[PDB]
């Protein structure tokens, strides 16, 4: 039957037995069996039956064909049969709107777990099972007018995962393909991220130029992201043939332009983007799966000339290439043989990897093709007693982790059996290397000997870990492992500088993860001190060996093992040390005033809270005393209850929260807020954050308060819970009931001044005028003191 031929075909594609693929989108209304809603045939010139063997997968791209057209029968009972005989699979294409509630069967089903599971079944039955084809393809493009809701995308993904339980690799019916095609980068494609593991292929349309001098920038940029979700052998890129009467916005120039001097110019692939795409390969991961064309029915038609690039549906500029004509699929076949002749898809053979057991495990993990070797960039795990030689492993030059497990019969590890990425900090794990006799890692800039099981290298006769970046100082763990290596050599041979090389190390420097001083101190010497130089300084090696200054580095360079000095002679402190380029120091004085400076001048008793930042995070926090210090003040006002104001009562309370993300002003040049601190405590200073302090809206200094008065309630005995709202407000507005404690007369961003040990529970702040004509604003008010 052609259900068992279909299954056999799909299983040979999914397991990668056809090399590079070529696929095509056939527009149903350009098949001669297609009829419109009228019942009239649309175009007799072409047919899917004629699609050659070189096309590996044919995508049914449906539009204009009516549902009662003879085409659907011709597809199911004739076309699929003929194409299966030459090894070609049929895949049905549907848009994502059939999945998210906007079109077709998705309007008839609720957005619930059982509803979406019934929708999935109805889709697989209507678009795969009943059409006779071998798989489904979901089209997810950008929606220019009327974007998709997060609820529609969350639905499309849930339906997609239920389809993937029915068909595809992770489905009940493994005989069908499950494909996605898209125009969306990973960042903009939540459905892809959720459905990737269940995909056979991702077909990413790249019609027209994609930026840069090679016209392929967006392809490389996107593969850099896509590679974290799918394998290269699942990635296909697409070009478009020239659609008839295509307008501006749909003119890609992916094939050659019309030539009046050469009618066959359209089927010449030299110079075309189609050819560039056939040749393009990923930088990482592996080799791609192949390429596909849109509108394969237009294969070989020359593209409309560049001078037509501006035609619209309103501004017709019809050309001879707008005609419909029969195609012999010449461009398709040339591009397919161009890809199968690509000598990068030759299988890895004994010439590349001589050891058969090594070659089996590389092929299992890296892929089949010679071109997969220089691209693979993940992990390789080599095990067992059958591997004798590691020749050929230097071809995996982008490997990120090499893991050697129980390689009992491997006698040699040398830098020329190792990938190039071992020189740029790739991980290397070795366990149970009981047969290893030569261990040469020279010149690979290795920062650690971590992961090398030195205890099990029991047959070692020589090693060379010279010219690396190792810390071999007394307390370093790498010196302990160096020692074991030297003892394993001693069992078999007299130690020599040649057979235990470890000199010329150049260990790189790092920032310490912490700093010792939680509490610093200066005397009151009337001098400037640098907080960075005194407390937050120095560098560490990878094994956390501290070096404080240039002299400590000089002592480090003279470290030796058995009188053999291991650090390179011309390695300089400037090269090892960390400059502290981005570093800033955030100080909070005892009156809660904030400044950003590394320098302090020790003139009086004071306490700072210090927060050091590197430009991103806080790296250190300490307290610093000058002299006897000073007790850290509290903001008495924080959370003060507002008891009355000339402005809006709910705007007023936002000058007593934590933030500067708000503003209080009135319809005028003057206002007052009166507030209650709860209890009565002792107040030594006040601080006002003016208008230009504002964090939610950039405010210029013309809106600043210029004159103002902070005040306490004259009567200490007064109880104002007794008088009622109308009297209370009039009482709190009468200025003869308050005494000036502080007077502002300058429009500074932050205004601070001292009080004379004010003990009061009721307060009022009056704005008496602004910096300009505009209504003066301010964001936060602070009364500073104890308890
Ligand atoms: Ca505030």
């Amino acid at each position: 039957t052609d259900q068992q031929v279909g299954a056999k075909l799909v299983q040979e594609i999914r397991e990668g037995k056809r090399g590079p693929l070529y696929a095509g989108y056939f527009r149903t209304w350009h098949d001669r069996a297609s009829t419109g809603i009228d019942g009239k045939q649309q175009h007799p010139e072409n047919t899917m039956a004629e699609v050659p063997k070189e096309v590996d997968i044919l995508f049914v791209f449906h539009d204009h064909t009516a549902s009662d057209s003879p085409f659907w029968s011709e597809l199911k009972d004739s076309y699929v049969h003929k194409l299966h005989q030459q090894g070609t699979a049929l895949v049905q294409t549907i848009g994502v709107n059939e999945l998210n509630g906007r079109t077709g069967l998705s309007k008839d089903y609720p957005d619930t777990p059982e509803g979406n599971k019934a929708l999935a079944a109805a889709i697989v039955k209507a678009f795969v099972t009943d059409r006779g084809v071998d798989g489904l393809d979901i089209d997810i493009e950008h929606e220019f007018t009327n974007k998709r809701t997060p609820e529609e995308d969350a639905r499309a993904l849930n339906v997609f995962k239920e389809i993937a339980q029915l068909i595809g690799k992770n489905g009940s019916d493994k005989s069908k393909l499950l494909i996605m095609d898209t125009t969306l980068s990973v960042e903009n494609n939540p459905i892809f991220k959720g459905i990737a593991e269940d995909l056979d292929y991702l077909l990413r349309q790249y019609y027209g130029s994609q930026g840069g001098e090679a016209e392929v920038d967006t392809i490389n940029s996107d593969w850099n992201q896509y590679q974290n979700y799918i394998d290269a052998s699942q990635f296909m890129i697409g070009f478009s043939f020239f659609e008839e009467s295509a307008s501006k916005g749909n003119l890609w120039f992916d094939v050659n332009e019309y030539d009046p001097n050469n009618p066959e110019k359209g089927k010449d692939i030299e110079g075309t983007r189609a050819k560039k795409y056939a040749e393009w390969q990923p930088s990482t991961g592996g080799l791609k799966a192949g390429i596909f064309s849109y509108a394969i029915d237009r294969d070989g038609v020359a593209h409309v000339p560049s001078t037509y690039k501006n035609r619209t549906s309103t501004n017709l500029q019809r050309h001879e290439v707008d005609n419909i004509s029969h195609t012999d699929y010449t461009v398709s076949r040339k591009l397919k043989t161009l890809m199968t002749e690509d000598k990068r898809y030759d299988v890895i053979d004994q010439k590349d990897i001589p050891d058969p057991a090594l070659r089996e495990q590389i092929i299992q993990q890296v892929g089949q093709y010679k071109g997969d070797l220089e691209r693979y960039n993940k992990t390789l795990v080599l095990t067992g007693d059958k591997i004798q030689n590691l020749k050929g492993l230097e071809k995996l030059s982008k490997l990120q982790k090499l893991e050697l497990r129980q390689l009992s019969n491997v006698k040699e590890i040398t830098p020329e059996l190792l990938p190039e990425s071992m020189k740029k900090d790739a991980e290397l794990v070795m366990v149970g290397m009981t047969g290893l006799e030569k261990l040469n890692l020279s010149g690979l800039n290795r920062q650690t000997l971590d992961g090398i099981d030195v205890n099990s290298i029991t047959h070692l006769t020589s090693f060379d870990i010279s010219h690396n970046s190792l810390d071999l100082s007394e307390k370093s763990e790498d010196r302990k492992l160096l020692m074991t290596l030297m003892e394993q050599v001693s069992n078999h041979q007299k130690i020599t500088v040649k057979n235990t090389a470890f000199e010329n190390q150049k260990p790189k420097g790092y920032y310490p993860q912490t700093y010792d001083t939680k509490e610093g101190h200066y005397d009151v010497d009337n001098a400037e001190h640098d907080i960075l130089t005194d407390f937050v300084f120095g560098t560490v090696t990878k094994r956390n060996t501290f070096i404080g200054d240039e002299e400590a580095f000089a002592i480090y360079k003279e470290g030796a093992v058995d009188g053999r000095q291991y650090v390179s002679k011309d390695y300089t402190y400037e090269a090892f040390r960390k400059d502290y380029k981005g570093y800033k120091v955030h100080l909070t004085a005892s009156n809660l005033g904030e400044t950003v400076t590394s320098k302090v001048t020790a003139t009086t008793d004071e306490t700072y809270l210090v927060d050091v930042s590197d430009g991103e995070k806080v790296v250190h926090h300490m307290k610093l005393n000058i002299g006897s210090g000073a007790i850290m003040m509290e903001n008495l006002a924080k959370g003060a209850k507002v008891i009355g104001t000339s402005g809006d009562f709910e705007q007023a309370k936002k000058i007593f929260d934590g933030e500067k993300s708000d503003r209080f002003f009135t319809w005028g040049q003057t206002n007052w807020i009166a507030f209650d601190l709860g209890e009565i405590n002792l107040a030594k200073e006040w601080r006002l954050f003016n208008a230009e302090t504002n964090t939610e809206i950039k405010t210029d200094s013309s809106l600043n308060v210029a004159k103002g008065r902070l005040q306490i309630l004259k009567d200490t005995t007064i109880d104002l819970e007794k008088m009622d709202i109308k009297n209370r407000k009039e009482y709190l507005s009468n200025d003869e009931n308050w005494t000036d404690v502080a007077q502002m007369d300058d429009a500074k961003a932050i205004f601070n001044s001292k009080l004379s040990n004010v003990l009061s529970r009721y307060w009022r702040f009056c704005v008496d005028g602004g910096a300009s004509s505009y209504y003066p604003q301010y964001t936060e008010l602070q009364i500073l003191g104890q308890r």
Side-chain angles (χ1 to χ4, degrees), residues 654-662 779-780:
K654 287 184 307 213
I655 78 166
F656 299 121
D657 58 20
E659 313 226 290
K660 330 287 171 219
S661 61
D662 46 69
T779 74
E780 179 87 7

Side-chain angles (χ1 to χ4, degrees), residues 323-342 344-350 352-466:
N323 287 317
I324 307 308
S325 51
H326 179 247
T327 182
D328 54 354
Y329 307 92
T330 294
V331 168
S332 295
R333 306 177 340 224
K334 285 180 181 191
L335 288 167
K336 167 68 155 182
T337 66
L338 191 158
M339 285 183 301
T340 60
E341 314 294 43
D342 195 334
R344 295 177 284 189
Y345 284 91
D346 282 359
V347 178
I348 293 161
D349 61 343
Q350 184 255 342
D352 294 308
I353 310 314
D355 196 321
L358 181 66
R359 182 170 65 252
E360 192 166 81
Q361 295 196 13
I362 282 177
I363 287 164
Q364 207 299 304
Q365 297 177 56
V366 157
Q368 326 178 32
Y369 311 111
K370 285 168 183 275
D372 284 339
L373 299 157
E374 71 196 323
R375 289 176 174 82
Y376 187 79
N377 69 331
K378 276 92 203 189
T379 301
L380 177 69
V381 178
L382 302 177
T383 63
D385 46 281
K386 296 168 156 288
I387 299 170
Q388 258 90 49
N389 204 40
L390 289 182
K391 177 70 194 204
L393 183 104
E394 75 277 341
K395 302 178 180 298
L396 295 181
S397 46
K398 291 190 196 218
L399 195 68
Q400 292 309 306
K401 183 183 189 184
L402 180 58
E403 197 168 1
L404 316 179
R405 318 209 149 239
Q406 324 309 330
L407 298 194
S408 62
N409 281 291
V410 172
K411 309 180 213 151
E412 215 150 301
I413 287 161
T414 219
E416 311 62 59
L417 302 166
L418 296 154
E420 184 64 21
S421 55
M422 295 301 309
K423 272 189 207 59
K424 280 170 190 171
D425 278 320
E427 287 185 47
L428 174 72
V429 177
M430 308 178 179
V431 196
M433 299 296 280
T434 73
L436 184 62
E437 303 187 308
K438 191 195 309 301
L439 174 46
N440 188 334
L441 307 175
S442 48
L444 298 170
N445 308 327
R446 312 292 300 172
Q447 314 214 39
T448 312
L449 293 166
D450 185 21
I452 301 161
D453 170 2
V454 291
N455 281 329
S456 210
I457 309 172
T458 62
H459 280 64
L460 188 65
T461 76
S462 67
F463 71 78
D464 186 343
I465 62 176
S466 67

